[PDB]
Amino acid sequence: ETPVFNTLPMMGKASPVSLGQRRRINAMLQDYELQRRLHSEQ
C-alpha cells in the first residue's frame, strides 16, 4: 500500500450510505455519515 498507486480506495466517494469497543465506533462512524446526508440543508 503506497496510497498513490491504489486506484480503488476503501469507501470511495460514490459508495452507498450504510443504514444498519471498536465495532461500536465503526457504527458511530457510519451513523455520522448517514446523518450528514439526511441533513444536507444547503
Partner 1 sequence: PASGALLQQMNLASQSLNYELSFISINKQGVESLRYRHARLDNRPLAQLLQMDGPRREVVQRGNEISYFEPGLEPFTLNGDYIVDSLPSLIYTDFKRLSPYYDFISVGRTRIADRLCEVIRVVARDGTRYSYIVWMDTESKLPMRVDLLDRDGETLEQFRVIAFNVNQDISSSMQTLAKANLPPLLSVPVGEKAKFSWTPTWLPQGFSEVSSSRRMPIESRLYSDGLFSFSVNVNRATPSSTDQMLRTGRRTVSTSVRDNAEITIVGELPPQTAKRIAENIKFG
Site string (7-36) toward partner 1, x via CB under 8 A: xxxxxxxxxxx-x-x---x--xx-xx--xx
Q: What is the DSSP string of 4-32?
A: GG-SS-TT-TTPPPP---HHHHHHHHHHH
**Does 40 contact partner 1 by CB under 8 A?**
yes
Burial class (CB in 10 A: 0-12, 13-18, 19+), 32: exposed
Nearer to Zn ion by Cβ, of 30 and 34: the residue is 34
* Residues in contact with Zn ion by the rule CB under 5 A: 39
Residues forming contacts to partner 1 in the complex (CB under 8 A) are 2-17, 19, 21, 25, 28-29, 31-32, 35-42
